Amino acid sequence: QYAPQTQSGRTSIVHLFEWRWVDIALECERYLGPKGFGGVQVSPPNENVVVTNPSRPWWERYQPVSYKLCTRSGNENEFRDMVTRCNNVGVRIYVDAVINHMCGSGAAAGTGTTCGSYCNPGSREFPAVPYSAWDFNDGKCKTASGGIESYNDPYQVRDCQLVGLLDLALEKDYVRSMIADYLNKLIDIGVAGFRIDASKHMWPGDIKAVLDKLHNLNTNWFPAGSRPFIFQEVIDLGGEAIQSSEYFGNGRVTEFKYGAKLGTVVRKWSGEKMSYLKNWGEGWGFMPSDRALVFVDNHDNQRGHGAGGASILTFWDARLYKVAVGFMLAHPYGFTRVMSSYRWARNFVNGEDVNDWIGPPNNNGVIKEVTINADTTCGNDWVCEHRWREIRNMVWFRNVVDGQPFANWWDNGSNQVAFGRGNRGFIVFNNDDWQLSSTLQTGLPGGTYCDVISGDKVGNSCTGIKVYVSSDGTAQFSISNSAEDPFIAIHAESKL
Amino acid sequence: QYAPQTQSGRTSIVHLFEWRWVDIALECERYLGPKGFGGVQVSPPNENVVVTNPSRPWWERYQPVSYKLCTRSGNENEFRDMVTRCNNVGVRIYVDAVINHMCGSGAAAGTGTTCGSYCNPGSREFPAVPYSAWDFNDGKCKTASGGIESYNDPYQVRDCQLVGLLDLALEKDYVRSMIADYLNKLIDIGVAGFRIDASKHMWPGDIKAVLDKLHNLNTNWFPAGSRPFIFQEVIDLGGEAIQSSEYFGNGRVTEFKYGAKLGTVVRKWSGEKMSYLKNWGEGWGFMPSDRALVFVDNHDNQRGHGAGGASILTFWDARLYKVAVGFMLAHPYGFTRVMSSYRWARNFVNGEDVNDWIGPPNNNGVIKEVTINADTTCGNDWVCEHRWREIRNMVWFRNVVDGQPFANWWDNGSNQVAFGRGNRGFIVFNNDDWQLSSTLQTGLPGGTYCDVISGDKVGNSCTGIKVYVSSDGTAQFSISNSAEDPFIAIHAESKL
Amino acid sequence: ATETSFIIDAFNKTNLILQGDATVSSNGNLQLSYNSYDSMSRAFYSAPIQIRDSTTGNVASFDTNFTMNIRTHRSAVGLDFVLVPVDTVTVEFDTFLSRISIDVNNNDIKSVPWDVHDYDGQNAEVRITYNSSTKVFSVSLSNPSTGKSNNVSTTVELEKEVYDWVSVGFSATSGAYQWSYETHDVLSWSFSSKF
Amino acid sequence: ATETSFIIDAFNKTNLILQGDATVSSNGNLQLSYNSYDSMSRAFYSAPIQIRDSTTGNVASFDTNFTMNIRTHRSAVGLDFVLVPVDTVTVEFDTFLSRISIDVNNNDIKSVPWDVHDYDGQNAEVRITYNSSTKVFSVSLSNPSTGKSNNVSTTVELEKEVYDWVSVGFSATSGAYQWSYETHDVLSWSFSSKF
Numbered sequence A, B: 001q002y003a004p005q006t007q008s009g010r011t012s013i014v015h016l017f018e019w020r021w022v023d024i025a026l027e028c029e030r031y032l033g034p035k036g037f038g039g040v041q042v043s044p045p046n047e048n049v050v051v052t053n054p055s056r057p058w059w060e061r062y063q064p065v066s067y068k069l070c071t072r073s074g075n076e077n078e079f080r081d082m083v084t085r086c087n088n089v090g091v092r093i094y095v096d097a098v099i100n101h102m103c104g105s106g107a108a109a110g111t112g113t114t115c116g117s118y119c120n121p122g123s124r125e126f127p128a129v130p131y132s133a134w135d136f137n138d139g140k141c142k143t144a145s146g147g148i149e150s151y152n153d154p155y156q157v158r159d160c161q162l163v164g165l166l167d168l169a170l171e172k173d174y175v176r177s178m179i180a181d182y183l184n185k186l187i188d189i190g191v192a193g194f195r196i197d198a199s200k201h202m203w204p205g206d207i208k209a210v211l212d213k214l215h216n217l218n219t220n221w222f223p224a225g226s227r228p229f230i231f232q233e234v235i236d237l238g239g240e241a242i243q244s245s246e247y248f249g250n251g252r253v254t255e256f257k258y259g260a261k262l263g264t265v266v267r268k269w270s271g272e273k274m275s276y277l278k279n280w281g282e283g284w285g286f287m288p289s290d291r292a293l294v295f296v297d298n299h300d301n302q303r304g305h306g307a308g309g310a311s312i313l314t315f316w317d318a319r320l321y322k323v324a325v326g327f328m329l330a331h332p333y334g335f336t337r338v339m340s341s342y343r344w345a346r347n348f349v350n351g352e353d354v355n356d357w358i359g360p361p362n363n364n365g366v367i368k369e370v371t372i373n374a375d376t377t378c379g380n381d382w383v384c385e386h387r388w389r390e391i392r393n394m395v396w397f398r399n400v401v402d403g404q405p406f407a408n409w410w411d412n413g414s415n416q417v418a419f420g421r422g423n424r425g426f427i428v429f430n431n432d433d434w435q436l437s438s439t440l441q442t443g444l445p446g447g448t449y450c451d452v453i454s455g456d457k458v459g460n461s462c463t464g465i466k467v468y469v470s471s472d473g474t475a476q477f478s479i480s481n482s483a484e485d486p487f488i489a490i491h492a493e494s495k496l
Numbered sequence C, D: 001a002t003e004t005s006f007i008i009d010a011f012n013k014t015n016l017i018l019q020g021d022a023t024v025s026s027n028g029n030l031q032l033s034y035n036s037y038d039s040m041s042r043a044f045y046s047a048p049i050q051i052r053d054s055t056t057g058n059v060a061s062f063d064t065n066f067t068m069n070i071r072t073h074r075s076a077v078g079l080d081f082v083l084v085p086v087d088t089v090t091v092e093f094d095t096f097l098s099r100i101s102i103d104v105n106n107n108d109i110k111s112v113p114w115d116v117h118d119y120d121g122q123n124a125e126v127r128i129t130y131n132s133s134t135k136v137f138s139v140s141l142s143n144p145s146t147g148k149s150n151n152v153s154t155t156v157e158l159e160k161e162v163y164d165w166v167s168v169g170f171s172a173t174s175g176a177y178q179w180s181y182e183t184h185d186v187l188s189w190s191f192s193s194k195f
């Protein structure tokens, strides 16, 4: 459950948020495969309710109406095609499994669904599954409203309705079986694992029950006896009754403390300095590395910060974001997930952004294709952070240093930091308001290396900065605080 | 430094507080040897200043004037005789080494000393050593008074005068050498180790320097290469700058948290219950077992509690004291020291006892001999706790179970507790206000055992309670809360 | 017994116990839920307050004022004032349910509806008072700028051992999906207990 | 900024930080040094107090009263009132040196002698006040039963960053040998800081 099941040597997955199956299939072949990406986290592939007010928000996809593979991203054949094509080039697919609930109890009965299925939320009727009133937690919930009223009561958060969503009775074998059939169909298609949406709202034992019913992975691409990779979404910053540790037995858990802490440090807020990252990881009170799925920002928390005051870093703050993602990709803690977003219009109405709901780029509701420009960037409002040189080269860096221990840490007592990974990679950051000029021990074999942040190693030369490491492993570094990317990274494969 | 150097199998030492050398010599042969006592801690054997107001208090012995073995306890020949005779019957002698200071700076110059030596405290002259003004810390001390003014400053507590006592310059090799000669003379006589008085007031490194100059123990009684046992008096309850751990490199340290905590529990104060002793030891925040010297009360803290409010248990509260000492002697934590006192008249003047200064039983200043009554108790006001059956038998219990792990703990959720030591001993306490009637697993071989608390195993019978342990190790226990000694203890050697 | 009183015109982390997504901004505002979603964050005054003196059975009267600013970006979702035993008594400003409740042990003793639209993104003054004599617990909410107000009172029995000592503070909850973006700010806070 | 005030007529461990040989007896008295010798014990109020607001450079005035009962059984040995930065300012009632000192960073800024015999075993009322305007720090000691008094005042400068936040409380020291038996009791304590 903890092993990602990626091909040999691939260490990261990217979230191609709201991408169509056909575009992901193409991306796998033309980029993700060649560039060493381990996998892709896809948006929920099952049928969801259509929300017209607001117009097709990203969150409508988290309100299931059936398990038919039919959404705005595509249909079942397109989904199968994508999984096959990606697997063939060594890029895995991880599905966002929405299994705690169906759609909102206040949803209109009808056929306003992505695949035309009929449902009557009011009477808890989902004939396309099928689910009936007795497959929900209405009678088990202890609150008068039927919704969660206190996060300090585990029974309320797990058995009551999460923001009005019909809560599935996951202790029933029938429900467990319906969900297992859905997940097994995906596994047989070739999916490598799942992101369990809203895990905090389900009992660890119930999730475990479903997981035990899952098949081993498709032997066409996976070794016999392989179990699906599992990462559960649990937001635990320490202020409540439910703890992330309760889910360690099912697989990995999202470590939300990671991005929040990192963001504060990189921004230099609350008296934090980069020199404090010396003991980053479990030292900061994070979960065990082998149970963690880490990331700088995710599809949900990258939104809602238009008015400032939030430490979360996103593509909106490109410079600081690249530094944070670079540090994450270089550090040995956890299994890393890279974010890939679409830009939306940040418009304010009385001091609050009103476009946090906006869905993917579209033409009258039909998701726009991802267009690739000559400079390898994307068009049609897809930001494609995974294509930024600095991020692209750092996921490669992570593959290269895979397994090497954290070593040769250095800091100037302020915001200039450096560390290596065994004898395969070294990275140095200058987050101070002054120049960095020092000779450091890199732990690397002597030679000339191309800095993979400012350029690439092309043929017999570097396109950007060159670092000269002497026979003793020491190298001179000069980083201006005015540099576009105030950090340098070198590894065994960027050596000339 | 941590090994007591006791004979094979002996696990406790007793403090024969203010006893004369001739009486200790006799006690060794007629009792301590036969009864399995490991050693004796003796009062300071070196010459001290005479205090006549109050009349010869116990504390005058902590104000040295020379290193001549001449005190109220006896002279050098009597001291040698005692060490030889005790060693011959397997009972070791540990000396109370007063090495941080000499006498009070306000002491009168003269020959009012226990051996007639001359000294002039005012001019820091101790010709019998000899020490001169330059052998003291007067110029190093940072305070205006020359005394300790704040215990939150390590320099003040170590380099300034402790309650007006002339502070020795322990960093000087001359001073270190004078003290080493004194200690080496004792070692050669046959002493097994030392209690380092006022260790908190000396630098750990200085003590270490002196210790490195010490000879190995006398091969007449000790194996070649034996180092003297060292236990340092450091009072660290957690409220200050100096910590007990700073002295771990020199030998054992007195764990004062032990008796204070135990006293609160046994008295059932502050919501404490005996059932909480389940994780007694390091679990309670105590120092490592192998660095600890433990005890219920010591010569100093057994005084000053006439007005109540103190948790410290002493012979004055016999019933509760025996329970505490019994628990200590049965538990595997630390090296145990048993107290042996003399009784004094507890007289109050305006709500405070005025006799905490009173010295040992005496005839015009001459210490009275220890008289033994037919019932094995002592006369002449010596209380002789070490002779109480309950304490005597528990030191034997400790020898018998030596090395056996803590096992088979049981508790009634209140103040009834029980535990064993491997398969060699078991003890049960009833500190609740009701009867104890339960069948417990003792971990001992089936048979009939004599309770060593209420009696002894004499010949083919028990003089007190008999415990019948079935083949499965279980035994029925019945302890009334009105029993004189509300606890029972059995071991491999009390079996019929 | 201990009576205590404090007035905070601008916050500082030093005398606070922060749990979860709770921070103090450079300008002294206590901020909760800014960086997270679907979770609870809490902030308590560092010293426990005595609500009931076991020695006399006497229960204290308390009064507290605070100014908050909730931004919905659009309790299950909302800001709650809590008295947590060192059995919790909570005053919930639930923006999801659109109700203000006086809750004790998860049981809403009394609740009134409120229009979050009248206070959204604006400084709201809150006063919570408890008179141990009449045993009346009251809550006053008002938008000083528009003059709007919401009030709710009931009788609560705090004469129980569990209420001897409690931690006083705030608890903010952020929802999921479209309800993931509400932020909560507390600008000032004064509290006073008396026997 | 935070102003805080508290009145304790009888102590309880709950809102205190106890270090070393410091306990609260069944009758509500804070007791220090009862079970030990040659060591220091401390008791602080659980919440840190702000003495200086860094945002404005403003330093607070504070006033505190407490009743103590020292029993010598006959500072190096004594009871001290302390303000410890979270550079310590101490008011020492030294029974060994027989002096009352206003100490800052171990330096006695001012001290007067006192006859411990006039207060030994009796309830003594102590008042310590600091006026940030005049920068005058004063100490008043009096035996309400006999009418005896001891006073000492001086000017102390608390206008430093280190004094921003401090823990307020008591520190008691017990000596060695014949000075091993002094006990210290604090029966009540009221404190108030204001900007």
Ligand SMILES: *[C@@H]1O[C@H](CO)[C@@H](O[C@@H]2O[C@H](CO)[C@@H](O)[C@H](O)[C@H]2NC(C)=O)[C@H](O)[C@H]1NC(C)=O
Binding pocket: A271, C011, C012, C013, C014, C024, C025, C026, C027, C028, C029, D054, D055, D161, D164, D165
């Ligand atoms: C809370 O108080 C603390 C302590 O006074 C403040 O931290 C200090 O701020 C001052 C003035 O800017 C600096 O000179 C010190 O270096 C700071 N101490 C540290 C360790 O940072 C803090 O600014 C206050 N916070 C708020 C929101 O008022």
Ligand SMILES: *[C@@H]1O[C@H](CO)[C@@H](O[C@@H]2O[C@H](CO)[C@@H](O)[C@H](O)[C@H]2NC(C)=O)[C@H](O)[C@H]1NC(C)=O
Binding pocket: C063, C064, C065, C127, C190, C191, C192
């Ligand atoms: C909370 O604010 C209320 C309302 O202002 C305070 O009650 C008033 O105190 C003011 C100033 O002393 C008086 O003029 C009024 O007579 C009081 N009542 C009202 C209804 O205004 C109360 O003191 C505050 N409590 C705390 C703990 O700060």
Ligand SMILES: *[C@@H]1O[C@H](CO)[C@@H](O[C@@H]2O[C@H](CO)[C@@H](O)[C@H](O)[C@H]2NC(C)=O)[C@H](O)[C@H]1NC(C)=O
Binding pocket: B271, C054, C055, C161, C164, C165, D011, D012, D013, D014, D024, D025, D026, D027, D028, D029
């Ligand atoms: C300090 O307050 C605590 C909590 O109220 C007191 O502890 C309680 O005392 C009451 C009344 O005797 C008991 O009913 C409870 O069982 C106690 N709680 C616990 C866990 O013991 C305590 O007595 C107070 N101490 C003083 C000195 O007033």
Ligand SMILES: *[C@@H]1O[C@H](CO)[C@@H](O[C@@H]2O[C@H](CO)[C@@H](O)[C@H](O)[C@H]2NC(C)=O)[C@H](O)[C@H]1NC(C)=O
Binding pocket: D063, D064, D065, D127, D190, D191, D192
């Ligand atoms: C400490 O006690 C002093 C002295 O009693 C208090 O000062 C007095 O307060 C009383 C009652 O309000 C007034 O009658 C007097 O005018 C005040 N001054 C004097 C010299 O008596 C002071 O309020 C107390 N401080 C604290 C924090 O409790």
Ligand SMILES: *[C@@H]1O[C@H](CO)[C@@H](O)[C@H](O)[C@H]1NC(C)=O
Binding pocket: C061, C131, C132, C133, C134
């Ligand atoms: C509480 O109510 C009582 C009785 O009606 C009233 O007389 C008193 O003023 C009130 N006290 C407080 C502190 O509100």
Ligand SMILES: *[C@@H]1O[C@H](CO)[C@@H](O)[C@H](O)[C@H]1NC(C)=O
Binding pocket: D061, D131, D132, D133, D134
């Ligand atoms: C402090 O001293 C000032 C100036 O002499 C005086 O006017 C004021 O009353 C004092 N304030 C306090 C709180 O003692």
Ligand SMILES: [Ca+2]
Binding pocket: A100, A101, A157, A158, A159, A160, A167, A168, A201, A202
């Ligand atoms: Ca659910």
Ligand SMILES: [Ca+2]
Binding pocket: B100, B101, B157, B158, B159, B160, B167, B168, B201, B202
């Ligand atoms: Ca000394």
Ligand SMILES: [Ca+2]
Binding pocket: A149, C092, C101, C103, C106, C107, C108
């Ligand atoms: Ca409620």
Ligand SMILES: [Ca+2]
Binding pocket: A304, C033, C034, C035, C036, C037, C174, C180, C181, C182
């Ligand atoms: Ca949020």
Ligand SMILES: [Ca+2]
Binding pocket: B149, D092, D101, D103, D106, D107, D108
């Ligand atoms: Ca001083």
Ligand SMILES: [Ca+2]
Binding pocket: B304, D033, D034, D035, D036, D037, D174, D180, D181, D182
């Ligand atoms: Ca004492």
Ligand SMILES: [Cl-]
Binding pocket: A233, A254, A298, A299
């Ligand atoms: Cl996520």
Ligand SMILES: [Cl-]
Binding pocket: B233, B254, B298, B299
């Ligand atoms: Cl001792």
